[PDB]
Ligand binder design. Structure first.
Ligand SMILES: [Zn+2]
Ligand SMILES: [Zn+2]
Lengths: 314, 314
């Protein structure tokens, strides 16, 4: 069975962590044709290290690879070092620019170590931020879609105060989020999605009974998106819509509106997609596991699940 | 098996709806002893009507009943009339005063018709409002607790604009919600509950990084509640806490924060408790169904679920 149906970048994450190890284990399990669609970004020295340990030298010749985040000393498995911090970011940066320029259609980043990156003197608050930075966009022009338990929920606003979010909300900002998320939905394998838009206020303002924000922001936005020919219901109260479970994409106005459903229903098997200008970036859903780095204990199931998700066919 | 363990008031709701019908069908299914703990508030004429329809004449003699919301004309099944609007409110008012005075320990209200009540010239924004009015409390001293799928979530604010909610939130208002909800928890059968408080902002402001509201409102409130000797964690991000599933009561800051989890996990089978003073009032979770009124085809499962919930053993 074939899980990779398009070109992808795989940044291998922290080269001292389990990222290199799981990168090889996942490519191992793909077919020859599948492997040629995955360009691996990271220091060759780290993939060599992981290949001797897991005894997968044969595979290195098949890998399509671009050097990024080279190290100036041998790989020290399990060790938190500024070097590996920088490697991680350079690798992820190489992968993202490859997506921007159109060489690949999406990016998967293997695990990072926050401390390592901070010790290099590099600001890192998460992939939403990094992606924005790298592409020259403001952080609010990149949207986060959570995916788990059949739910896809893009968020118009994210890591800010509720009040700050309400002040930023506009018809345009909603439109941008949905456009970004419908594009992302084609890649995920749902070309013509059914879309639901959450209300800002309870019961979507109930007309204007509970505030004017929905009549100013979400109602105008839904009518513009229909006129361009999208299938869009709402605004509706977030509680009531989610319960019906009959849409392929939900559009949350605030962080909590979209994160509560997801963390309740998909406590483990859930993906975070950061979406910019052509660029869909997902993490694997786990840490770098420095204490088992190079010990042959980590499997690639999380990485393979992520590849299946970003590599579905239209 | 016995579901009623204490004295309860059952206001029969709109006498032209299915309220009378479901009241009888639910009492039917209880044992003789259970029936004597439920005092039925409403116009006798409407219970007579529903007794012929559902063919339960035998039952009327066993009912403990207080006349309330008497009608001045025959019962008209299916019809929206100011009179039935007034009946509903009088019945529910009789039931609530019975709770206030200590004759019963909680109240269940069968379905009303909003239009009917409005056409009588009666202000009605829900049971929170009615209960406050009847008890001589301000509307913001009555809180709504949703209960479904093992989750209990009180809400500090409810049917208002998000902005209006943020402006109303204070340490005191949180404290009041929790005290009302802990009292309610004793009645529900959890005397000494473990409590979780949601953050106003994502990640509970993450200190003060994502807004100052949590440091001003929820953090001071939690410290006061501990010092009086309650078991209270938070504020935490709503998503993250709910996922742990290790508390008996969650404290939501906004409507949507508490209604999304509930309607997703218990999309039909959730109860709405209005709590004020010692008075816990619950609706059945459905409408008055005027199109089947009188046809004897209404299901009492929602009412029985509500009775089981408020008629809790410990
Ligand atoms: Zn978050
Ligand atoms: Zn509601």
């Amino acid at each position: 069975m074939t899980i990779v149906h398009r070109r992808l970048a795989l940044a291998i994450g922290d080269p001292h962590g389990i990222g290199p190890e799981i990168a090889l284990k996942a490519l191992q399990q793909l077919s020859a044709t599948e492997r040629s669609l995955i360009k691996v970004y990271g220091p060759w020295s780290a993939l060599e290290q992981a290949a001797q340990i897991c005894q997968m030298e044969s595979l290195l010749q098949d890998l399509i690879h671009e050097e990024a985040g080279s190290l100036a000393q041998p790989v020290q498995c399990g060790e938190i070092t500024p070097q590996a911090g920088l490697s991680t970011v350079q690798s992820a940066t190489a992968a993202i620019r490859a997506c921007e320029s159109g060489e690949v259609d999406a990016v998967i980043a293997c695990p990072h170590h926050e401390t390592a990156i901070h010790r290099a003197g590099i600001a890192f608050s998460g992939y939403p931020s990094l992606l924005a930075n790298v592409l020259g966009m403001n952080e609010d022009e990149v949207f986060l879609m959570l995916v788990g338990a059949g739910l896809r929920i893009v968020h118009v606003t994210l890591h800010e105060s509720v009040r700050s979010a309400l002040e930023r909300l506009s018809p345009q900002l909603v439109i941008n989020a949905v456009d970004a998320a419908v594009q992302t939905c084609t890649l995920l394998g749902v070309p013509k999605p059914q879309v639901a838009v959450f209300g800002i206020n309870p019961h979507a303002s109930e007309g204007q009974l509970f505030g004017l924000e929905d009549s100013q922001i979400t109602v105008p936005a839904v009518e513009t998106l229909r006129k361009r020919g999208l299938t869009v219901d709402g605004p509706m109260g977030a509680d009531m819509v989610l319960a019906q479970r009959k849409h392929d994409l939900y559009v949350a106005m605030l962080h909590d509106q979209g994160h509560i459903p997801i963390k309740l229903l998909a406590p483990n098997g859930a993906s975070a997609l950061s979406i910019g200008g052509r660029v869909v970036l997902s993490s694997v859903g786990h840490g770098s596991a420095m204490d088992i780095a190079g010990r042959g204990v980590a499997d690639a199931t999380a990485l393979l699940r992520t590849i299946a998700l970003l590599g579905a066919q239209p």
